[PDB]
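One-letter codes give the sequence; each number marks local geometry. A record appears below:


***
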Amino acid sequence: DDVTVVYQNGLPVISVRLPSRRERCQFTLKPISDSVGVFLRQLQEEDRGIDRVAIYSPDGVRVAASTGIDLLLLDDFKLVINDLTYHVRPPKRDL
């Protein structure tokens, strides 16, 4: 339960723990414009020691980058930071 998904002002907020400092860093994104590559590119740009960054679907399949993040916020998934295979369940939305 080390990574959150809690909405504020109609948009997702993803507070995750970084590898360098343990202070939780939240990530505000847009379901419309922001994509998975904006999120992971961001994450790489808040820790210089993040080596391989990934996101997988429940069935292990790597989710693409140009996929909209609104489409990622329909089901649960896995955010992978280094050896950390993270599991995330996002609250219910419509679209």
